[PDB]
């Protein structure tokens, strides 16, 4: 099958591309800047921008299935071009915050455009990415083998990006996923303190956890920049994002147990080294 993967250079898309290519599909990788190593050997890199849909004309020509990275502003226009091109199937990178009812204005409009098109679809709704912990704790672990945390006894069910790619790949390539939205959590509830331990384990190094205040925290997050600054308000509960609920995992789709945060830490150990 001819499959175009948008979000191809991303945490999830890199994996989707590699697996579709191994299955021997005819794979195309959309990026805003075409260069070697955006995709593996034998994968066609197409230059284009989801915010400028006319740039996608050549990328969508002759395509059977599409992995769609979420861009609510143009989703309807991109879906419309997919439909014109004769795409039969769209698999969406969405968010478990849609399942929860928190997201009605970013990922949901992308889903809604896809649902309204008449093509086959599957929504992949990951919960909290394990990658968030490289983004937030990488810099200080790499600097000082320390983590500064206001909520060490808090936590959720972080999900391994390869679980997300596994589900996307099946939705793009087998029957029985049409009209499903799969919410993807990690297999265990873990405290931030436990998450720091598992990184310490994966690295084979001590990491000191310094329990700080939320105020101290946000200054540190604003100093650090990048992911930690851009989301600091939402991460410390200064602004609202929106006995537990039944927590679904990739097992429901793959037939295999969801990857653990321990496994995730081992896969990314070297990215935490100084």
- Indicate whether 77 belongs to the interface with ligand NAP (CB under 6 A): no
Q: Checking phi first, is residue 155 left (phi over 0); if not, alpha (psi -120 to 50) or beta?
A: left
From the list ligand NAP, ligand DM2, none, partner contacted by residue 6 (C-beta under 5 to 8 A by kind): ligand NAP
Number of H helices, E strands in the chain: 13, 11
CA distance 160 to 94: 15
- Indicate whether 32 belongs to the interface with ligand NAP (CB under 6 A): yes
**Cβ(65)–Cβ(3) under 8 Å?**
yes
- Indicate whether 180 belongs to the interface with ligand DM2 (CB under 6 A): no
Q: How many residues bind ligand NAP (CB under 6 A)?
A: 24
**Segment near ligand DM2 (CB under 6 A), from 34-42, 75-83, 95-103, 139-147?**
95-103
CA distance 51 to 78: 9
231, 260, 262, 267: residue in contact with ligand DM2 (rule CB under 6 A): 231
Closest of 115, 117, 114, 95 to residue 106, by C-alpha: 95
Using the minimum distance from each CB to ligand DM2, give the nearer residue, 46 or 95: 95
Dmax over Cα atoms in the chain, in whole Å?
56
From the list ligand DM2, ligand NAP, none, partner contacted by residue 234 (C-beta under 5 to 8 A by kind): ligand DM2
Give me the residues that bind ligand DM2 (CB under 6 A), please.
95-97, 100, 102-103, 105-106, 127-128, 132, 156, 227, 230-231, 234-235, 241-242
């Amino acid at each position: 099958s001819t499959i175009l993967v948008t979000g191809a250079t991303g945490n999830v898309g890199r994996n989707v591309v590699r697996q579709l290519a191994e299955r021997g599909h005819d794979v195309r990788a959309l990026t805003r800047r075409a260069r070697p190593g955006a995709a593996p050997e034998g994968v066609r890199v197409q230059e284009g921008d989801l915010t400028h849909p006319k740039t996608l004309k050549d990328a969508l020509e002759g395509v059977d299935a599409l992995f769609l990275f979420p861009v609510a502003a143009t989703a309807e226009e991109v879906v419309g071009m997919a439909k014109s091109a004769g795409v039969r199937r769209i698999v969406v990178l969405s968010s478990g915050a849609v399942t929860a009812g928190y997201d009605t204005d970013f990922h949901l409009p992308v889903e809604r455009a896809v649902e309204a098109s008449g093509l086959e679809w599957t929504h992949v709704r990951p919960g909290e990415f394990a990658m968030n912990k490289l983004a937030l704790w990488g810099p200080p672990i790499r600097a000082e083998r320390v983590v500064r945390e206001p909520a060490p006894d808090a936590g959720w069910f972080p999900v391994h990006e390869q679980d997300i790619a596994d589900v996307a790949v099946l939705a793009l390539t087998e029957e029985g996923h049409a009209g499903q939205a799969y919410t993807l959590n990690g297999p265990e509830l873990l405290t931030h303190r436990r998450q720091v331990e598992l990184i310490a384990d994966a690295m084979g190094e001590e990491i000191r956890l310094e329990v700080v205040t939320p105020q101290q925290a946000r200054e540190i997050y604003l100093a650090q920049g990048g992911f930690a600054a851009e989301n600091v308000d939402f991460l410390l509960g200064f602004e609202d994002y929106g006995s537990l609920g039944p927590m679904p995992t990739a097992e429901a789709v793959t037939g295999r147990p969801a990857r653990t945060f321990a496994q995730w830490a081992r896969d990314h150990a070297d990215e935490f080294r100084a």
